[PDB]
Amino acid sequence: VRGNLVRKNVDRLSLQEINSLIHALKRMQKDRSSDGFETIASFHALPPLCPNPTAKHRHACCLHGMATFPQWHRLYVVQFEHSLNRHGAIVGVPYWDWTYPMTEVPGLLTSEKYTDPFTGIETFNPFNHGHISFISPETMTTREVSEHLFEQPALGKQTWLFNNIILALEQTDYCDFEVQFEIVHNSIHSWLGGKELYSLNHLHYAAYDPAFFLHHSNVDRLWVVWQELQKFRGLPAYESNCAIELMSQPLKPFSFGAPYNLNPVTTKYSKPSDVFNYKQNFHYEYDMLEMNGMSIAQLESYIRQERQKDRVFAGFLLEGFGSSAYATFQVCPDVGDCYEGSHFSVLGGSTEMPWAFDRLYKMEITDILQAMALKFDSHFTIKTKIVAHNGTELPESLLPEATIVRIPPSAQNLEVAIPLNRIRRNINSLESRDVQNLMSALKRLKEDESDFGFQTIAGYHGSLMCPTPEAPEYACCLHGMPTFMHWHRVYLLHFEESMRRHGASVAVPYWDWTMPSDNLPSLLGDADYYDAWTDSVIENPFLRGHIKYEDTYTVREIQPELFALAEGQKESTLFKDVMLMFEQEDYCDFEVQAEVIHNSIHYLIGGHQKYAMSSLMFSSFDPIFYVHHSMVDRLWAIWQELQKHRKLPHDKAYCALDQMAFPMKPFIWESNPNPTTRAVSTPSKLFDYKSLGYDYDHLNFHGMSIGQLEALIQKQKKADRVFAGFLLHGIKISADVHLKICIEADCQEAGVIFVLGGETEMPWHFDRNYKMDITDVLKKRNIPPEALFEHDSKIRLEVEIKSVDGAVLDPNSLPKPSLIYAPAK
Amino acid sequence: VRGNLVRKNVDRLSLQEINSLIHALKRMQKDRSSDGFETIASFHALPPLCPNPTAKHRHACCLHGMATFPQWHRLYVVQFEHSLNRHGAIVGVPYWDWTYPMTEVPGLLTSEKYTDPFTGIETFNPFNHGHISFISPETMTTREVSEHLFEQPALGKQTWLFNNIILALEQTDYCDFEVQFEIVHNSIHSWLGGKELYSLNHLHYAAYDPAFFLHHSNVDRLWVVWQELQKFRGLPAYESNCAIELMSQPLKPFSFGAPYNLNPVTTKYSKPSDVFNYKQNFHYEYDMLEMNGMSIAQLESYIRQERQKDRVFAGFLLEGFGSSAYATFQVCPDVGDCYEGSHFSVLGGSTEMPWAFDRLYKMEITDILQAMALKFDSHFTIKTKIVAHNGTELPESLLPEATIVRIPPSAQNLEVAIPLNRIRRNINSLESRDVQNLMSALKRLKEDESDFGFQTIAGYHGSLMCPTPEAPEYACCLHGMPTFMHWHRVYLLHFEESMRRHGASVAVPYWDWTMPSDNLPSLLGDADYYDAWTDSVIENPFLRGHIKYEDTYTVREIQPELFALAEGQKESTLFKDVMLMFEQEDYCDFEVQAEVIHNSIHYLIGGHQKYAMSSLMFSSFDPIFYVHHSMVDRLWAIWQELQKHRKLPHDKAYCALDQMAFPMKPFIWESNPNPTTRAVSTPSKLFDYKSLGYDYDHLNFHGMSIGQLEALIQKQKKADRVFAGFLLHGIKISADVHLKICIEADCQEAGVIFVLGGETEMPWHFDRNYKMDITDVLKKRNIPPEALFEHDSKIRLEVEIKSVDGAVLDPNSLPKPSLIYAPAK
Ligand SMILES: *[C@@H]1O[C@H](CO)[C@@H](O[C@@H]2O[C@H](CO)[C@@H](O)[C@H](O)[C@H]2NC(C)=O)[C@H](O)[C@H]1NC(C)=O
Ligand SMILES: *[C@@H]1O[C@H](CO)[C@@H](O[C@@H]2O[C@H](CO)[C@@H](O)[C@H](O)[C@H]2NC(C)=O)[C@H](O)[C@H]1NC(C)=O
Ligand SMILES: *[C@@H]1O[C@H](CO)[C@@H](O[C@@H]2O[C@H](CO)[C@@H](O)[C@H](O)[C@H]2NC(C)=O)[C@H](O)[C@H]1NC(C)=O
Ligand code: CUO
Ligand code: CUO
Ligand code: CUO
Ligand code: CUO
């Protein structure tokens, strides 16, 4: 016949709601009955009554430092709640959540006086302080506020309450949770109470402060949130697998029927095992179960994200000592300088029941060690100083010295709910609004003459500038080496960033040329369009790049073979070539294949022309260059996941360890528009693309899930194959290498290799030889591979080297290819 | 399948949420595309594209002053919403709700600059203002804040928004809702915008200010509330039964599926009929659906409560307009003195499509009309002076002079959700805690030496202090007359009011003596109890009230027949006495029956003693007095309920109007502790007990519902009955009048009557004769009712009047009874 009481946010309360709350607490404070505040406050600690109120010695009263701590305080809150429902509150016990960052202590808690808006009569605010009746009629609770409460997020840093609550919500075991949970809860006792004798910081006098119940309203809310989490994870939220022995022992003093606890329902559900079902048993709800505005789903995702990182903790073993105290620990390396670690607090009183935690209470020091430039396994110690409520050093003998525990990263897939503008999608799938946004954006970026502008970022690739501005005689980008992929990843990110700066809600799209295409995609090919908002006709920003120091626009002379490269269907050399690339389980072995095939598209779309995609020095000026590299980057993305699928390394590579360590030249300089690319300049850092903040929808090749990709790759390794190996290097210009096999003197159609380069080039030499399989070619000509080993049967390889210059053709410089027979294993 | 966007409260936003929002809007503002801010803001008004973007003359653009106003703007918001979701906002469009009273303008709107907490980078706040690009490039929106924004509830009065928001939600037809709903929405346009030309108050430029959208996120929410309300009532929420003509016509410019709207879902759902299902079609939710913290259930309860009241409205027929305007009306009586009436605003521009409401926009004037002490149908006029946006006074001819409408009170039962401590309960149903609460409070109250204290409030009835001290020579309480019930209603209230003042969470219990009782209920009967909290034994506060000026404690000498009077239990004289009381459909007829039965109990528990319940002058000092009057008051409450059921007057009476008008003497005096009893000292005010704020656990007699009571009452009238009529009046002392019918000098057991009085009394004469039916006594006596008409047959009536003091006894100073034959009909 009656609906649940709702515990609203304190600052959510209306004038009508506040009014009833204040008047209700006012009456239940003047109420000398057991239903009154002095009496309810007495349940917690100081006038002790819990062994039994008649006992000679009383170690009473409340449960602290044990798994049953949350239940006692839940039921204790419903005790206080039922009282002011009956004393006329229209709402349940409000909470202020420390889940959000703090600016001020709540008004209804701090304001000395209260004016009833409806009667206009100013009165003392019942929530400002509590009276401790038995000591003196004139003994008020008092408070002292720590700056710790009002902490705000820094650049990388997050507030103490945010971090430790999440570390608590992180737990999947109740007892593990409860330990972290309780000590987080100790904070506001510690931060509002302070050094003051009759306060939240003293176990005895705490419940006499009205704040206690607004506080623990939120403590209980956190537990429900954690309960909600356990339901979400398919775990037992309403039961406890650990500490089962304590779930039977009924909650005192509530367990006392007859004269001491008059509330019927509270007595009935005195077993902590019955306190689990709060909504059915005690009939109260929360308006919102949110941790800092996060949904239970948003919460769990965050948690799982945090679990993926490599984390190291400090562990403390906590035993009660009969007083409240504040703990400070520092991280100290072998070198003298010590840095400030963190803090935690204990709640305590002289009549506290002795307690000992059966677990380690963990605190996270990972961000601190990372700033200390020292890893988890390297020589650092923790010193801890703990002051009493009194307050003087405890000293140091009290708590066993802290332990340190690192948790290894756990490799598992995540949601990860990337923003809508940071996802790179197939250029064919783009909607019209995606098109207009991009085209409007790129024009502004090109017209941008600042350092963020298109001219400058185009210059990072092909201008004559690296290694340093004054010295070269050199070209800046990275080819052809293991860190080639890495360089163009930042470069692409740098482009994405500059785009958003001019209103791009669309990440740079990728054109998939591995699929059959009769023509260039419209976004890249189309010359002009009619804007409707002006009567003006605008030229497509994606089809023409201006090179300001050469006074020329880029040119695209598209070789007929590009469209003809991939018409299998699915039987395309380009498909087969890429599949051979995916096969590689080594990053370096994968990289050469990746870059050579990447050279192909450069050559064929801009060929036989200077100031084109074919020309390494100027290719970055053509806006397709970026659309192109969004594709090769995605091809890498597929491979990283392919590797992750095979358990082989994805985030790291055992290659170019001298390279991977060092940051990349054009980006790290002080002369860089955005701080973000400067930050991630190092190859090791940008190995994984998710941490960089973008993603591809989606990662799959020709309608094959990654399970299917590896499946056919295993199928290709099962057949005997023959390769031609090419050791490639810088020839200071672009070229096409044609390969053709001769059975005797007759030679037809073996294959083609493209090499990128420029007049201004960075001299490069490949660590190994690029492969291209002639397996299917030999089957076509009935030249059996085993006959390759035969001296009588004569086969030869001929290369036709023709530079971009046209033809020219070029004398034979590059090392001649090698035959590789790869038996199936 | 992407998760719904949530429209959060502004103040609820986390730092991360504010961050993603600010950067997103920052981007989409620099977005020159159609997806950008400048283009979307155009959709509303000034660069006018709406008839079609290419027309010579363009009536553009947004729908205003018509039924489909909410659908256009709902769709308009999802337009703006999807932009910044795609521009990277993690949350939906925040709302700023005026449902709560205002103190300030919300933060992300009012701060000129914003510093990213995470990067430490200070930037200009994108929500502070908007750019109007087609005017000068350095042209921004500005604001001007009216005092009206920050209105707070003072005494009985409530803020403009609260009053008028609810008036809108009150509506049951969509069109009637919409008309009120929209003028409400116009307030913040007028209040945030002000005199400024480029502001929210000018139709043209409003949407260029981002504040518009936070505003209209709440506007939509309010409609969703109203939708949710209509769902509660079993009415159509997702359809509109009125203005079906308009619901078909697609919303422009959204309707344009061309370069003008590149949003797919927006074009598809450009039908305003399609705009209703927001969650399915547009995929956005609200964090909470609450009007000033009130739930939808709480809302309708308030709304229904307001429908029971008698209300009068001023009506305005709104056609417009050249511009935005501010309207002001005053209420003026026959005499010249004017009071401030409310105000309202309209939104407009030079390019607005002509509009006319087909109904009256209602404003409420009931509260203020009362302050002018004049009724609705009487001699008063409304003059309105309306000033424009420029603003020259607009000619009275511009808007038709206002009309005035009175909406009659709708009599139907309500919820009404009364506080727990203000419920008066059957004394036997009380739990152990209510008992302890009652006692502790009464102890404090009797101890209380203040004017709020028991000595002073009990002195109100039994003194000797009626107007004017020290003239009396008089005695104050009101017996015996129609206003007897009224006087003792306030008295009981005054008693409750003072009890709460000492921590009583329990309203005064009623003890039902119509039910058979072996002894007095322990709350009244038990002498002492042992408090467990203090080792002391305390005596029950409910017996032996102390009388200060007589230095004597009251005594209860209980006559043996009181418990024996009700041995029926339905056959009990008391049930039959009360059932006869309920039968009266006139108030005064009801009053005499009630007050005589009232005297019966007063007399029998404290009989034959001075300083007792039987003594009129000192009955008030015995605590059980108040428990008794809780019972008779409940009897009156049931009677009132019956009158309502019988469709006869309940809240009013056609009896003595001389007495009903004047305030009552002990309470109205400036020498009264609490202002609440002073105000309601008038008998007219006290008629409905709910308006006073308390209630009874249930209104039912002997297991009969109020329907069953009237059913049995009709049953009794269906038989022939014989009464004896006693005209009673003030003799200066209490006495008991025994009725005895004698056939022929043989007399036995006819009935009994009691009358209350004291040395210090208020002289009283009853308006009628008390009736008591002897019909059952006669049928036992085998005396035919028709033999009463026989002169030949011998029967007569004798009264042996004995004083309260045994015997003493008194001579016959009261008129002898009259025989009344009531033929059944
Ligand atoms: C201040 O507080 C500390 C913490 O309680 C006191 O330390 C305890 O004092 C009791 C005697 O009252 C001893 O029996 C305990 O062994 C002490 N425990 C510890 C850990 O010190 C301390 O005595 C107090 N001193 C002052 C100056 O107030
Ligand atoms: C485009 O259409 C006409 C011009 O072709 C513009 O309106 C007028 O056209 C008539 C002839 O049909 C002329 O006599 C008027 O002098 C024109 N008026 C103006 C103001 O140009 C029309 O304005 C044009 N559409 C717009 C508004 O851009
Ligand atoms: C301010 O606005 C009002 C109307 O918004 C102006 O009055 C309008 O004047 C035009 C003539 O140019 C009339 O056609 C309109 O009917 C008028 N509006 C109404 C309803 O009165 C007024 O002139 C403006 N004030 C100034 C001087 O700027
Ligand atoms: O309540 Cu027992 O301490 Cu937080
Ligand atoms: O590699 Cu330098 O960019 Cu295609
Ligand atoms: O809606 Cu167009 O005006 Cu606020
Ligand atoms: O009537 Cu004034 O006392 Cu019961």
DSSP string, B545-575: -EEGGGTEE------THHHHH--SSSSSHHH
Question: Rounded to whole angstroms, what are the CA distances from B724 to A236, A359, B574, B796?
Answer: 75, 87, 17, 11
Residue pair A534/B59 in contact (Cβ under 8 Å)? The answer is no
**E strands present in A350-398:** 361-364, 380-388
Separation of alpha carbons A712 and A710, rounded Å: 6
Which amino acid would we find at residue B805?
A: D
Q: Which residues of A touch B262 (CB under 8 A)?
A: 431-433, 436
Say if CB B286 and CB B95 are below 8 A apart: yes
**Which H or E element spans position A332?**
strand A325-333
Q: Whose CA is nearest to atom 20 of ligand 3?
A: B322
- For residues A468 and A669, give the distance between their C-alpha atoms in angstroms, rounded to a whole number: 9
Q: Which one of the ligands is nearest to B58 CA?
A: 2
In three state form, how does the secondary structure of A617-658 look? CCHHHCCHHHHHHHHHHHHHHHHHHHHHHCCCCCCCCCCCHH
Three-state DSSP state, B737: strand
Helix (H, G, I), strand (E, B) or coil at B46: coil
| Cα B142 from chain centre | 42
List CB contacts of A762: < 8 A, sequence separation 6 or more.
A466, A474, A475, A476, A477, A478, A479, A730
B277 within 8 A of B238, measured Cβ to Cβ? yes
Asked whether B347 lines ligand 6 (CB < 6 A), one says yes
Method: X-ray
CA dist A393 and A383 (Å) reads 14
The DSSP call for residue A729 is: B
Residue B377 CB: number of other CB atoms within 10 A? 9
Distance CA A568, CA A516 (A): 8
DSSP letter assigned to residue A381:
E
Q: How far is CA B456 from CA B447, B451, B493, B721, in A?
A: 11, 5, 15, 46
User: Which residue among A31, A287, A433 sits closest to B262, beta carbon to beta carbon?
Assistant: A433
User: Which amino acid belongs to residue A237?
Assistant: A
Q: Which two tokens stand for residue B171?
A: 């509506």
Q: How far apart are CA A85 and CA A77, in angstroms?
A: 12
A150 phi and psi angles, rounded to 5 deg: -95, 20
Per the CB < 8 A criterion, the answer to whether A393 and A387 are in contact is yes
What is the C-alpha separation between A327 and A384, in angstroms, rounded? Answer: 7
Give the whole-angstrom CA distance, residue B190 versus residue B195.
8
DSSP three-state, residue B258: coil
Query: What letter would DSSP give residue A423?
Result: E
- Residues 6 or more apart whose CB falls under 8 angstroms from that of A287 comprise A6, A7, A8, A9, A12, B288
Both tokens assigned to A769: 């030889």
Task: Give B173's contacts (C-beta < 8 A, 6+ positions apart).
Answer: B241, B242
Closest CA to A659 of A620, A686, A689, A692: A686
Q: Which residues contact A248 (CB under 8 A, 6 or more apart)?
A: A271, A273
Task: Provide the residue type at B426 as one letter.
Answer: N
Q: Would you report the helix, strand and coil content of chain A in percent, each value rounded to 5?
A: 35, 15, 50
Query: Does B534 contact A at CB distance below 8 Å?
Result: no
Q: Give me the residue from A29, A88, A421 closest to B88, CB to CB.
A: A421
How many C-beta atoms surround the C-beta of residue A63 within 10 A? 21
What is the CA angle A687-A690-A695, rounded to 5? 115
Q: What is the dihedral of CA A508, A514, A517, A521, to 10 degrees?
A: 10
In angstroms, the CA B65 to CA A637 distance is 55
How far, in Å, from the CA of A616 to the mean position of ligand 5? Answer: 7
Q: Can you tell me the distance from the alpha carbon of A412 to that of A414, in angstroms, rounded to the nearest whole number?
A: 7
User: For tokens 């946006």, what's the residue?
Assistant: B389
> CA-CA distance, A687 to A485, in Å (whole number)?
9
Whether a cis peptide bond, with omega within 30° of 0, leads into A459 is no
How many angstroms separate the CA atoms of A197 and A204, rounded? Answer: 9
Other Cβ atoms less than 10 A from the Cβ of A645: the count is 14
Q: Which ligand is nearest to the CA of A764?
A: 5
Is the beta carbon of A324 within 6 A of some atom in ligand 1?
Answer: no
**Per-position DSSP letters for B662-683, written without gaps between them:** SPPHHHHSS--S-HHHHHT-ST
Of ligand 1's listed atoms, the one at least distance from the Cα of A325 is: 4
**Strands B339-346, B325-333: pairing kind:** antiparallel
Question: Rounded to the nearest 5°, which phi and psi values hold at B653?
Answer: -145, 140
Identify all chain A residues contacting B88, using CB atoms and an 8 Å cutoff.
419-422, 505
Compute the distance from residue B137 Cα to the ligand 2 centre, in Å: 27
- Which residues neighbour B745 within 8 Å (Cβ) at sequence distance 6 or greater? none
**DSSP β-ladder status, B721-729 and B818-822:** antiparallel
What is the distance between the alpha carbons of residues B209 and B213, in angstroms, rounded to a whole number? Answer: 8
State the helix-helix crossing angle for A174-193 and A160-170, rounded to 10 degrees: 160
Q: Which residues contact B735 (CB under 8 A, 6 or more apart)?
A: B754, B755, B757, B801, B802, B803, B804, B810
Q: Which of B421, B425, B450 to substitute to test the interface with A, most A CBs within 10 Å?
A: B421
A678 near A667, Cβ under 8 Å?
yes
Residue type, B577: D
CB A521 within 8 A of CB A623: no
Instruction: Return the residue of B nearest to A439 by Cα.
Output: B33
Cis bond upstream, residue A488 (ω within 30) = no
What's phi and psi for B73, nearest 5 deg?
A: -70, -30
Q: What is the DSSP letter of B10?
A: G
Instruction: Name residue A426's beta-bridge partners.
Output: A510
Asked if B14 and A294 come within 8 Å (Cβ–Cβ), the reply is yes
Closest CA to A324 of A350, A359, A363, A361: A350
Q: Residue B265: how many CB atoms within 10 A of its CB?
A: 15
Which residues 472-511 of A are in CB contact (within 8 Å) with B?
Answer: 500-505
Give dist(CA B495, CA B476) in Å, integer. Answer: 16
φ/ψ of B212, rounded to 5, equals -40, -45
Q: If you count residue pairs, one on A and one on B, with CB atoms under 8 Å apart, how many are there? A: 178
C-alpha A254/C-alpha A271 separation (Å) is 9
The vertex-A210 CA angle with A207 and A212, nearest 5°, equals 50
Residues 6+ apart with CB under 8 A from B66: B243, B246, B355
Between strands B361-364 and B311-316, the pairing is antiparallel
Chain A touched by B100 (CB under 8 Å):
yes
Determine how β-strand A695-697 pairs with β-strand A423-425: parallel
- Going from the C-alpha of A156 to that of each of A70, A153, A310, B118, B615, the distances in angstroms are 32, 8, 16, 7, 82
Alpha-carbon span A277 to A416, nearest angstrom? 32
User: For tokens 């006029």, what's the residue?
Assistant: B381
What backbone torsions phi and psi does residue B819 show, to the nearest 5 degrees? -80, 130
A573-583 vs A706-716: helix axis angle to the nearest 10? 90
Q: How far is A492 from chain B (nearest CA, A)?
A: 19
The Cα–Cα gap between A11 and A9 comes to 6
Q: Which residues contact B714 (CB under 8 A, 6 or more apart)?
A: none
CA distance B42 to B448: 71
- In a 13 Å sphere around the CA of B814, the CA atoms on its Cβ side amount to 32
Deposited resolution, Å: 3.0
Place of tokens 């469009």: B93
* CA distance linking residue B514 with residue B570, whole number of Å: 8
Protein residue whose Cα sits closest to atom 3 of ligand 4: A203
Q: Are B149 and B109 in contact (CB under 8 A)?
A: no
A118: closest chain B residue by CA: B155
DSSP, collapsed to helix, strand or coil, labels residue B687 as: helix
Cβ-based neighbour number of residue A776 at 10 Å: 13
Count the Cβ atoms, other than its own, within 10 Å of residue B717. Answer: 12
Contact B356, B67 (CB under 8 A): no
Chain B, 294 to 333: residues with Cβ < 8 Å from chain A are 294
b (16+ CB within 10 A) / e for A423-461:
ebbbbeebeebbbbbbbbbbbbbbebeeebbbbbbbbbb
Other residues' Cβ atoms within 10 Å of the Cβ of residue B460:
22
Beta bridge partners of B818: B725
Residue B494: both structure tokens together: 């005054």
| Backbone dihedral region for residue A382 (phi beyond 0: left; psi -120 to 50: alpha; all else: beta) | beta
- Report yes or no: A165 and A185 within 8 Å, Cβ to Cβ: no
**DSSP summary character for residue B757:** -
A28 sits in which H/E element: helix A15-30
Distance set, CA B571 to CA A703, B231, B514, B576 (Å)? 90, 50, 10, 7
